[PDB]
Amino acid sequence: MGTQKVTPALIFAITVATIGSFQFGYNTGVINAPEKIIKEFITKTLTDKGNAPPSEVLLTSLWSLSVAIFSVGGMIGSFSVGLFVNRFGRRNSMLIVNLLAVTGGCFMGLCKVAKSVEMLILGRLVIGLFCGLCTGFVPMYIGEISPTALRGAFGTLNQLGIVVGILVAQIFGLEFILGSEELWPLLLGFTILPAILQSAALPFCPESPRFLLINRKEEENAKQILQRLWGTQDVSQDIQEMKDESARMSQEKQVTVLELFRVSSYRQPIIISIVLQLSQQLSGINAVFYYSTGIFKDAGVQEPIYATIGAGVVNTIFTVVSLFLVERAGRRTLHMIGLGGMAFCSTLMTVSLLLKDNYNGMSFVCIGAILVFVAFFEIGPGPIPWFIVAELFSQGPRPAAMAVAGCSNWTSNFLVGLLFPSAAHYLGAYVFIIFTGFLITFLAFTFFKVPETRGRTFEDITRAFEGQAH
Ligand SMILES: CCCCCCCC/C=C/CCCCCCCC(=O)OC[C@H](O)CO
Ligand SMILES: CCCCCCCC/C=C\CCCCCCCC(=O)OC[C@H](O)CO
Ligand SMILES: CCCCCCCC/C=C\CCCCCCCC(=O)OC[C@H](O)CO
Ligand SMILES: OC[C@H]1O[C@H](O)[C@H](O)[C@@H](O)[C@@H]1O
């Protein structure tokens, strides 16, 4: 660190940014607990308007739309990240898009009194747009304001906000909290509250000093930001690194999404970036999490909701473990340990489910395998893919790269949700071997192809890719 310090100003800026992370986690998790209540809302709304009651097929299809349109919004929003952050700045983009959060939140909060299934769906779409933007904005901002020596640790706070968001959503989802037939619209509308808090705090957060110096050529203002954030007058090493990046950006053509795949020095890190997002989603994490309640039930958990909240707690604990290890073990090591551990547990899910009707003891192995799967997920594959894309690129290509990588993350999530039910229908317990196959494939990819980013400047990493390309 040298004379660099973790100041209250720095902790403030990072924590305020991760309110967006919290929003992504909350909106991801919140819809699941009130599924039956929301289906009753859809039924009653259709018949209140005079229609025939929907079949189970239509209810399932409208429920699935309500859930999945969030991912569609996220695909669009994440892909749009580059547009916003280069035009408005990183801090200013986070401020502006809270208009989407409050709007989507109000649509969801008002859909019941408006007796409108359309408003629920529109609300989920709009909050999806917002969350997709957040998943790119937050690790970018944190990556650009963090001291290099702590960039991974601070990057992991993005995922910590996400898993805290999921857990709070699960806890609120309880029937005696906000998950009642009465108040479920408030469960959804809750997302307006972190938006108001974040929006009030964001003006007092600095704009990215990298955006200021490199994109806007405001060296003096950037230097003063760093000096305050890092609690030291001496920031020459970092300013000169940014000036090197400014020279680079001035010497490279304006970056487009398509160019990322055409240029060898860009194609290596964008393929790494995309494959790392795939390793996160094609792990099956959201399928395992969503369907955990039913799997727990089938293995004999009498009160499955408590096991799923237990998973949410494990989810949080091991994100904190990752936080404390990622600068020591490095990104490569934690990502590989997580992928390998998940491959073991997903295989054990298949084996235990195949055996449990003959050997009941294997029921408990199944329950344990899901919990340990989540633990290994958060050791690396949860936190690292979101922030590592910021690390793999210099200032110029970073927004387009995070747009592409973030979109690939949301899109692969969408595909898992779309295809998993059919795959499970044909393969039964063997469906989890599909995730095992991906996990192993990406474990091999990570070992051979993913560079260690810990403690390295963006310019260091970029020069290394150019050297490999040459
Ligand atoms: C202007 C007044 C505003 C209205 C008042 C509303 C406050 C009540 C709702 C709070 C949402 C809770 C926000 C939770 C955000 C947590 C961020 C996070 O999870 O941080 C992870 C890690 O700590 C990163 O440092
Ligand atoms: C009504 C009787 C109770 C039965 C139900 C109790 C289970 C509720 C808690 C957690 C479920 C997991 C949700 C939190 C994690 C979300 C994982 C996820 O990926 O959710 C996406 C899914 O498509 C959704 O949108
Ligand atoms: C009707 C039978 C067809 C099957 C069901 C209909 C299709 C569902 C499609 C996608 C669901 C994806 C769930 C969306 C919520 C997950 C949000 C999330 O946490 O991830 C976002 C992104 O992946 C960053 O990680
Ligand atoms: O903790 C689970 C969450 O981890 C990561 O943030 C994923 O991007 C998200 O899809 C998942 O729901």
From Swiss-Prot:
Region (Important for selectivity against fructose): 277-279
Membrane topology annotation: Multi-pass membrane protein
Annotated tissue distribution: Highly expressed in brain. Expressed in many tissues.
Sugar-modified residues: 43
GO molecular function, one term: dehydroascorbic acid transmembrane transporter activity
Keywords noted in UniProt: Cell membrane, Cell projection, Glycoprotein, Membrane, Phosphoprotein, Sugar transport, Transmembrane, Transmembrane helix, Transport
Transmembrane segments: 11-32, 65-85, 91-111, 119-142, 154-174, 184-204, 270-290, 305-325, 332-352, 364-389, 400-420, 430-450
Regulation of catalytic or functional activity: Deoxyglucose transport is inhibited by D-glucose, D-galactose and maltose. Galactose transport is inhibited by D-glucose and maltose.
Pfam family for this entry, one: Sugar_tr
SUPFAM superfamilies noted in UniProt: MFS general substrate transporter (SSF103473)
Residue spans, topological domain Cytoplasmic: 1-10, 86-90, 143-153, 205-269, 326-331, 390-399
Location in or out of the cell: Cell membrane; Perikaryon; Cell projection
Keyword Cell membrane on entry: yes
Gene3D superfamilies associated with the record: MFS general substrate transporter like domains
GO biological process, one term: D-glucose transmembrane transport
Keyword Cytoplasm applies: no
Alphabetical list of NCBIfam families matching this protein: SP
Family designation: Belongs to the major facilitator superfamily. Sugar transporter (TC 2.A.1.1) family. Glucose transporter subfamily.
Name of protein: Solute carrier family 2, facilitated glucose transporter member 3
